[PDB]
Design an enzyme around this catalytic site. Structure first.
Site, short mmCIF file in Angstrom:
data_model
loop_
_atom_site.label_atom_id
_atom_site.label_comp_id
_atom_site.label_asym_id
_atom_site.label_seq_id
_atom_site.Cartn_x
_atom_site.Cartn_y
_atom_site.Cartn_z
N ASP A 1 0.84 -1.19 0.00
CA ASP A 1 0.00 0.00 0.00
C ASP A 1 0.88 1.25 0.00
O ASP A 1 1.82 1.36 0.80
CB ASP A 1 -0.93 -0.01 1.21
CG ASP A 1 -0.18 -0.01 2.53
OD1 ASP A 1 0.12 1.08 3.05
OD2 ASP A 1 0.11 -1.11 3.04
N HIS B 1 4.74 4.24 -3.46
CA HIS B 1 5.46 5.44 -3.85
C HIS B 1 5.99 6.22 -2.66
O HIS B 1 6.96 6.98 -2.81
CB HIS B 1 4.56 6.33 -4.71
CG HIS B 1 3.15 6.42 -4.21
ND1 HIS B 1 2.14 5.60 -4.67
CD2 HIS B 1 2.58 7.22 -3.28
CE1 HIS B 1 1.02 5.90 -4.05
NE2 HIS B 1 1.25 6.88 -3.20
N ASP C 1 -10.71 0.43 -0.65
CA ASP C 1 -10.62 1.81 -0.22
C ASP C 1 -11.56 2.76 -0.95
O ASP C 1 -11.81 3.86 -0.44
CB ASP C 1 -9.19 2.34 -0.38
CG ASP C 1 -8.29 1.94 0.77
OD1 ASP C 1 -7.54 0.95 0.63
OD2 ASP C 1 -8.34 2.61 1.83
#
Ligand SMILES: OC[C@H]1O[C@H](O[C@H]2[C@H](O)[C@@H](O)[C@@H](O[C@H]3[C@H](O)[C@@H](O)[C@@H](O[C@H]4[C@H](O)[C@@H](O)[C@@H](O[C@H]5[C@H](O)[C@@H](O)[C@@H](O)O[C@@H]5CO)O[C@@H]4CO)O[C@@H]3CO)O[C@@H]2CO)[C@H](O)[C@@H](O)[C@@H]1O
Ligand SMILES: OC[C@H]1O[C@H](O[C@H]2[C@H](O)[C@@H](O)[C@@H](O)O[C@@H]2CO)[C@H](O)[C@@H](O)[C@@H]1O
Lengths: 1526, 67
Positions: free
Chosen positions: A533, A536, A668
């Site tokens: 998750d 980045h 999500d």
């Protein structure tokens, strides 16, 4: 079997992209291991690195790579292994990289710089995907169906979980994604992990309990498993955080956040006393917020000391200035700005008298001034006594220093409270977040920026919690010192979690790296992969280390990541280095129908009818290569990567876009019920499943849950209601993808078309191998937007079959249970009425939808393109090698080349080149004309190109390829090549129109590659083993050597005749030129190995000897023209080149020709029986030239008049040649002559140049005498061996001179006559009149020229004598003379014909000029400036030879103590050929031009391909090969 | 200023580069091939402890003529 990929590198070591797939990653295809082979039995893949020959990287070059040498050696990121690059100027080097285990591997190159230094290239990565099997069945990566399940909503028992497993198994998912199954934290959010090293005590107690459950999922339901892995944070209440508080950023580890800590605890201290010293504890007015902000204005902001964190303490510095006033004092710099320049003086003190860390944040008063240095400047600027206005001056300076800090403070504070009253509003005042509860201790006014606790070491700490900046760059660690987000309150925090401070490595946080390592390899032992998750936000070096530790435990680790970095390039870089196998894409992000169709288009595949890659004219074709003679050495059980055709040029490794895992709904994003409607669940999931990638869905999407489940709060359990909603359809979709996964492999194998009309979205999935396909019509339900009718769907050359159709309807609202999450009741009605009309004539299928097709419905059709079966690819990729079995080096010319004028010769002017509408004609009529156009088309997949349009508009170009060879059918092997094209083009015409272009380019490219390989096999070893550049030069030999109908080299027959150039020197009398043929004979015929063809040309021209000369224009053998003095000596030089190279070449001397003209110069007795008459031997012909020139020739051109030359003056026809026997030089010519290679006779009626030669080279020419010396040296050693009889030479009077005396005469007088000495003091021993001279250190261009100013003109002809007669030159004189030519006369591709410093320099050649200029008009500038390419060949041949004798740096010690050229010389040689390699690459004609304007400017009148332009460059490669590479 | 080979003439002020093979264990040996009697000199350039360039004296050696 064969699992090898070819990765060609550029001259700078960078990988070469074979096709334009976009921004991507060098990914290797996911394939199962061979039948019954485990990891280690054999290399999984072998990457063949191809380094160009002579490239700057090869100079002491080494290939580095972190690939382990064998399976026993473990993988290390930073341990690279050596690989030696075998340097060669001809042959490319191939270095294999054997890979035994999937993972991330990179390679870089080190080499010797041109500065004799060491240089290194970038690190270039390539990923080997993991091998995913369930029991013993391989799972292709693009057939993965992942079901994401949340642990705490599946029940409290393991069997309560296995009931959910059976539900997703019936839906035929093959993979399950787990939210982390670890002990959860205080807030019980699945991502705030209490303890990383132990699983949830509610369900599990040991690793073996959960490992058995995952292995149970594998054997029972055939389902693999993977979890989330959290690197960025941990729960705010971990017992190990008390022991090791340094694992996060605190006031010790990250001191810059100390200012943010005292502001966060100024709000937990404030939010509890809010009502006492305030009024609006919980109201919903805009003014209610303002009184809290006014409470903020004085109670927190006003009570934080005006923030000395930025501002230097003013009065506490003056206090510490008088304190140390009198210690280290006095300065001396005279650069101290005046007290008038207030701004500059402040910055002067900022840089000199400051403590470390000035300007940056730290403690309360971190920024301070160095006193002893500050007062030392004050004493130098003002006074040494303190009371002399220092308190005013020192304070004035410090106040000016704090001006940018104060304005840095006002810009910070404004963002602190603007972020506050914009967040408190949404948080409290219900705009879209209903939660305006009276501010409590659990829900204060301030979101907790820091987690407070007392540690086991005694001290109090304050770790913070990560989150995400609104629109900030995720690559910037917002907790690091580079960001001010925690201070300016620009962070949306997660109170459940807490920082995880990784440093530059394990040295900055030892216990954190050791714990996360054991936590990673714990889940790696159990599960098949990971999910990351917010990948980045995890630093690269952090993610790299732990993912490699996991792959050492589980070599087939499957990595998924939600990766949204700054751009696609950053996304590819993360995938490159981390080894990510799939990227998460969300379908719910599409706001409208058009955004969904574009998202589906990105991950659907390539357009229908996309071009297939083929090796063309940009590849090396080694004659010694393995071949699939019928494309049959493949076994399906081997699971080998296939070559493109019968030639075994392995599959190229090119960057492809990273693989995608398309999620129709994650855990999500909001439910379709929330963002759109519930009915859209069916069409949305169908469009996702049709994409050629991995797909997934969250649990509840198929079961139409009402709203997104709160991962933090909710405790209800999934309902046991089976087969609800889309569960039936997902069973169909996943089962259909299992049938497709068996054969679809690479990116070129799955094509797609997507259409969007209103609320409908059309998806057409197509397999390019067999033609099988699916068609999806899905009516989306974003909103209920009325009835819309879709037009008639039309599929060309295709038959359709109904598969299934469904509609999703809502039957009221969802039940409201407090213990079990139940979905919305939905009906799944099957639909009918789809009319499939098929026109049996046009083969066109029409599809009409029924009026009962409500929004939220789908319909799937099975489709099959007509004309395509499974056996089509094998029929096209086979037989071409056997078809070229009987081809010869002559017959290949008619298959590949032939200019339109050459084709008009065979077709009497009827055929020619195929005209492409809105484009033009290909440069050649053969396959080369198509390949030159198709290479850029295939590279860009330009289906909109005019040729691409014409190929699908009809079969004209298809039949044109086959019908051409009727003109040349009777030639060797052409008939069998035409039959292969006929059989393959016929089968192609049976395909749909839109598929013809991709298959047309595939058939032409395969036969082209077979014809090019056949050429390299018939040629010699030095050519058939070299670089693309050398082979491309050698292919020009086939372009020029062809049989014709309107001309030949023999007057009685029509045989192969080397053309001067294409297309303007190929037909009738314009083809064969004696001067041109024998300059190119060594390069195009001897270097290549065409020994027999080279003999034919020597014998054919020997028949037409006259005046002791070889004719310039050879009219096959009839009525020629002897207006050339160069030809006979270039001809006699080609004889020497033949005897030297051809084994047993001395046999040519005694070959008898039939001279078609009597010995005494007669007339034109072509029909007179005295033509055949007598026979002459080549030995006699050589002597006849030497003795006739010596005895003095005398003739006027036969058949003189305007019929011969319409511009040459009357005195110009009487040309002569005589030998000055005092020097030995051969003189000849007049100022009305053009008997040299610079043959340009003026023709301007306005500039009065009609008949005036532009370059009359009268007198002793350097080339003629240089070839004369070479001929004399040749016949002298020939007589020593008994192959030449003659040594006598007759003089006009009657005297005799021995051939050795003539040889010594030139040896003693040549350089004396031509060399212009660099010293004026030696202008007496080299025959120089200093009045007319341009430069010295130059070998003259002529001797005794009619106009003496042309004797001393720098022209590139002196190099011809340097190459053929190097004994005529002292080394130091010649080396300096050719160095001047390199600086002055050397252009980029061609050699400047005249010194630019001369006044006659006209470098632009335009044959069509109607001006009054004596030179430029009608193109008299032909040889007075323009850059010719063949002189470049003779130039660099002597540039290499004389630099190897003079410059010691161009020599290096070699084996057998034989001195070989140094890499310094090869480097200088390679640089002077880059423009030549670029030219033949980016030219429609596959050769080198005849002429070039000034400084590489393309000359339109120049012939684009010339025989002696490429032939003289092949001469250089043969010199380096026969002398140093044996 | 020693010419690299016999073909190269002698110049007083044309000096040629020679790379010193640095090692903490092994000394480096560099040969100066002399083909003609005359006056030859050599000096050394190196990186100073101030990261600057420094040069030593010119040290000469004479090769006597052959009579
Ligand atoms: O069919 C029989 C043929 O017999 C006779 O041919 C003669 C020519 O007519 C005559 O001019 C001469 O040929 C010379 C020419 O005089 C001389 O100037 C030179 O010509 C150059 C061009 O000046 C130059 O521009 C270039 O021409 C190329 C051009 O660049 C290219 O772009 C393209 O247009 O093709 C052109 C050539 O066709 O190069 C040429 C060649 O160097 O050299 C010529 C050859 O020496 O002598 C010929 C003797 O047979 C009759 O006169 C003719 O009418 C008859 O048709
Ligand atoms: O001599 C110096 C002089 O050279 C140039 O003149 C040329 C002349 O144009 C040619 O005909 C040649 O053959 O004679 C001279 C050779 O140098 C220019 O005048 C200029 O470069 C320079 O002054």
């Amino acid at each position: 079997a064969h699992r090898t990929l070819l990765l060609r590198l550029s001259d700078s070591g960078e990988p070469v992209t074979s096709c334009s797939y976009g921004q991507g990653v060098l990914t290797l295809p996911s394939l199962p291991l061979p039948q019954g082979k485990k990891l280690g039995d054999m290399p999984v893949y072998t990457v063949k690195l191809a380094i160009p020959a002579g490239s700057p990287v090869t100079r002491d070059g080494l290939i580095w790579t972190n690939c382990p040498p064998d399976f026993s050696t473990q993988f290390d990121r930073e341990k690279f292994y050596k690989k030696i690059i075998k340097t060669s100027f001809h042959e490319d080097d191939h270095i294999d990289l054997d890979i035994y285990v999937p993972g991330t591997y990179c390679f870089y190159l080190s080499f010797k710089n041109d500065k004799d230094e060491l240089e290194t290239t970038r690190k270039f990565y390539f990923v080997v995907l993991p091998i995913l099997s369930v029991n013993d069945k391989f799972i292709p990566l693009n057939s993965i169906a992942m079901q994401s399940v949340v642990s705490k909503w599946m029940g409290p028992t393991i069997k309560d979980w296995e009931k959910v497993f059976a539900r997703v198994a019936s839906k035929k998912y093959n993979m399950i994604h787990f939210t982390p199954l670890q002990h959860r934290g205080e807030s019980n959010s699945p991502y705030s992990i209490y303890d990383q090293l132990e699983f949830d005590p509610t369900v599990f107690k040991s690793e073996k309990e959960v490992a058995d459950m995952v292995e149970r999922l594998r054997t029972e339901h055939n389902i693999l498993s993977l979890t989330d892995i959290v690197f960025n944070h941990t729960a705010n209440n971990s017992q190990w955080l008390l022991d090791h508080p340094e694992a996060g950023y605190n006031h010790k580890t990250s001191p810059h956040l100390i200012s943010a800590i005292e502001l966060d605890k100024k709000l937990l201290d404030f939010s509890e006393q809010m009502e006492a010293l305030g009024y609006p504890v919980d109201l919903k007015t805009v003014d209610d917020l303002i009184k809290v902000m006014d409470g903020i204005k004085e109670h927190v902001i006003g009570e934080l000391k005006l923030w000395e964190f930025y501002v230097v303490d003013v009065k506490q510095t003056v206090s510490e200035l008088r304190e140390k006033w009198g210690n280290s004092k006095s300065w001396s710099d005279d650069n101290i700005p005046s007290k008038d320049d207030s701004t500059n003086l402040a910055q002067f003190v900022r840089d000199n008298a400051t403590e470390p860390g000035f300007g940056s944040l730290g403690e309360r008063g971190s920024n301070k001034i160095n006193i002893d240095k500050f007062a030392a400047i004050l004493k130098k600027l003002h006074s040494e006594d303190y009371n002399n206005g220092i308190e005013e001056l020192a304070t004035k300076i410090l106040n000016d220093i704090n001006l940018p800090f104060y304005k840095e403070y006002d810009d910070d504070i404004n963002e602190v409270l603007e972020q506050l009253f914009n967040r408190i509003k949404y948080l409290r005042i219900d705009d879209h977040g209903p939660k305006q509860g009276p501010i409590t201790k659990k829900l204060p006014l301030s979101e907790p920026y820091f987690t407070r606790f007392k540690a086991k070491d005694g001290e109090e700490y304050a770790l913070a919690n990560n989150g995400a900046i609104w629109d900030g760059n995720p690559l910037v660690d917002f907790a690091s010192s580079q960001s001010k987000a925690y201070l300016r309150r620009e962070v949306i925090v997660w109170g459940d979690c807490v920082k995880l401070r990784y440093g530059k490595g394990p040295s900055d946080s030892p216990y954190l790296w050791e714990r996360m390592s054991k936590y990673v390899e714990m889940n790696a032992r159990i599960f098949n992969g990971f999910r990351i998750d917010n990948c980045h936000s995890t630093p690269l070096h952090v993610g790299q280390y732990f993912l490699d530790v996991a792959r050492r435990v589980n070599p087939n680790l499957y990595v998924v990541a939600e990766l949204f970095s700054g751009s696609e390039a950053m996304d590819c870089l993360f995938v490159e280095r981390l080894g990510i196998s799939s990227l998460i894409r969300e379908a719910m992000q599409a706001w409208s129908e058009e955004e969904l169709s574009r998202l589906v288009h990105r991950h659907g595949g390539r357009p229908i009818g996309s071009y297939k890659f083929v090796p063309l004219d940009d590849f090396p074709y080694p004659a010694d290569v393995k071949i699939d003679e019928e494309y049959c050495a493949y076994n399906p059980d081997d699971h080998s990567v296939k070559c493109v055709s019968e030639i075994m040029i392995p599959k190229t490794l090119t960057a492809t876009p990273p693989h995608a895992l398309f999620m129709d709904c994650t855990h999500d994003n909001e439910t379709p019920n929330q963002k759109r409607t519930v009915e859209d669940t069916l069409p949305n999931a169908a469009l996702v499943a049709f994409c050629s990638s991995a797909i997934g869905s969250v649990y509840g999407y198929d079961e139409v849950f009402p709203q997104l489940l709160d991962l933090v709060q909710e405790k209800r359990t999934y309902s046991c209601a089976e087969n609800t909603g889309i569960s039936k359809v997902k069973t169909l979709l996943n089962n259909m993808r299992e049938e497709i996964a068996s054969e679809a492999v690479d990116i070129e194998d799955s094509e797609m078309h997507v259409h969007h009309d209103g609320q409908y979205i059309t998806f057409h999935r197509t397999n390019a191998k067999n033609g099988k396909g699916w068609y999806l019509v899905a009516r989306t339900k974003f909103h209920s937007s009325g009835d819309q009718m879709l037009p008639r769907i039309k599929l060309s050359q295709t038959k359709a079959t109904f598969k299934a159709a469904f509609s999703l309807e809502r039957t009221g609202d969802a039940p409201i249970s407090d213990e079990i999450i139940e979905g919305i009741p939905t009906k799944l009605r099957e639909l009918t009425g789809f009319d499939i009309g098929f026109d049996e004539n046009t083969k066109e299928t029409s599809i009409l939808l029924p009026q009962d097709f409500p929004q939220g419905s789908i319909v799937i059709f099975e489709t099959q393109q007509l004309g395509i079966d499974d056996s089509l690819d094998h029929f096209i990729r086979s037989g071409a090698i056997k078809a070229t079995e009987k081809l010869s080096l002559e017959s290949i010319n008619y298959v590949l080349y032939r200019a339109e004028q050459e084709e008009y010769d065979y077709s009497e002017g009827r055929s020619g080149a195929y005209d492409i509408p809105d484009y033009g004609k290909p440069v050649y009529c053969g396959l080369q004309g198509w390949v030159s156009i198709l290479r850029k088309i295939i590279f860009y997949n330009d289906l909109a190109h005019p040729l691409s349009n014409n190929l699908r508009n009809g079969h004209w170009a298809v039949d044109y390829v086959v019908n051409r060879l009727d003109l040349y059918k009777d030639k060797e092997g052409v008939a069998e090549v035409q039959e292969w094209l006929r059989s393959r083009m016929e089968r192609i015409k049976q395909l749909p129109s839109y598929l013809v272009p991709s298959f047309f380019a595939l058939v032409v490219g395969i036969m082209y590659g077979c014809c090019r390989l056949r050429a390299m096999q018939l040629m010699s070893d030095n050519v058939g083993k070299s670089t693309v550049f050398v082979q491309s030069l050698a292919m020009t030999s086939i372009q020029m050597v062809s049989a014709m109908k309107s001309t030949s080299i023999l007057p009685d027959q029509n045989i192969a005749a080397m053309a001067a150039g294409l297309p303007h020197f190929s037909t009738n009398y314009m083809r064969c030129w004696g001067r041109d043929v024998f300059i190119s004979l060594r390069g195009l015929l001897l270097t290549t190995g065409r020994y027999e063809e080279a003999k034919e040309h020597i014998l054919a021209f020997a028949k037409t000897l006259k005046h002791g000369l070889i004719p310039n224009l050879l009219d096959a053998g009839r009525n020629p023209r002897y207006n050339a003095r160069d030809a006979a000596w270039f001809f006699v030089q080609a004889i020497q080149d033949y005897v030297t190279i051809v084994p047993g070449g001395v046999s040519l001397l005694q070959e008898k020709v039939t001279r078609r003209f009597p010995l005494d110069d007669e007339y034109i007795p072509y029909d007179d029986p005295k033509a055949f008459s007598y026979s002459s031997t080549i030995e006699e012909i050589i002597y006849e030239i030497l003795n006739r020139h010596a005895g003095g020739i005398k003739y006027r051109e036969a058949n003189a008049g305007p019929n011969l030359d319409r511009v040459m003056k009357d005195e110009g026809f009487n040309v002569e040649v005589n030998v000055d026997w005092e020097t030995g030089l051969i003189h000849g010519g007049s100022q009305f002559n053009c008997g040299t290679w610079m043959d340009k006779m003026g023709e301007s009626e306005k500039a009065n140049s009609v008949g005036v030669p532009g370059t009359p080279r009268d007198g002793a020419a350097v080339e003629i005498n240089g070839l004369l010396k070479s001929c004399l040296r040749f016949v002298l050693q020939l007589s020593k061996d008994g192959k030449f009889k003659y040594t006598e030479v007759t003089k006009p009077d009657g005297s005799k001179i021995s051939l050795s005396s003539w040889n010594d005469l030139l040896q003693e007088n040549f350089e004396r006559c031509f060399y212009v000495p660099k010293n004026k003091e030696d202008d007496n021993k080299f025959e120089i009149d200093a009045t007319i001279i341009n430069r010295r250190g130059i070998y003259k261009d002529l001797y005794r020229s009619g106009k003496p100013y042309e004797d001393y003109q720098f022209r590139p002809n002196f190099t011809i004598a340097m190459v053929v007669a190097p004994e005529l030159f002292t080394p130091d004189y010649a080396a300096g003379a050719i160095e001047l030519a390199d600086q002055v006369l050397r252009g980029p591709v061609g050699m400047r014909t005249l010194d630019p410093s001369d006044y006659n320099y006209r470098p632009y050649y335009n044959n069509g000029e109607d001006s009054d200029d004596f030179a430029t008009s009608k193109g008299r500038n032909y040889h007075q400036g323009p850059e010719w390419v063949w002189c470049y060949g003779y130039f660099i041949r002597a540039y290499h030879y004389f630099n190897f004798l003079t410059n010691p740096k161009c020599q290096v010690e070699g084996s057998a103590k034989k001195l070989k050229p140094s890499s310094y010389l090869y480097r200088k040689l390679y640089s002077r050929l880059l423009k030549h390699r670029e030219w033949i690459e980016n030219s429609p004609w596959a050769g080198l031009a005849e002429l070039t304007n000034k400084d590489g400017e393309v000359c339109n009148d120049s012939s684009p391909t010339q025989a002696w332009s490429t032939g003289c460059l092949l001469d250089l490669f043969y010199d380096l090969w026969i002398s140093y590479e044996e």
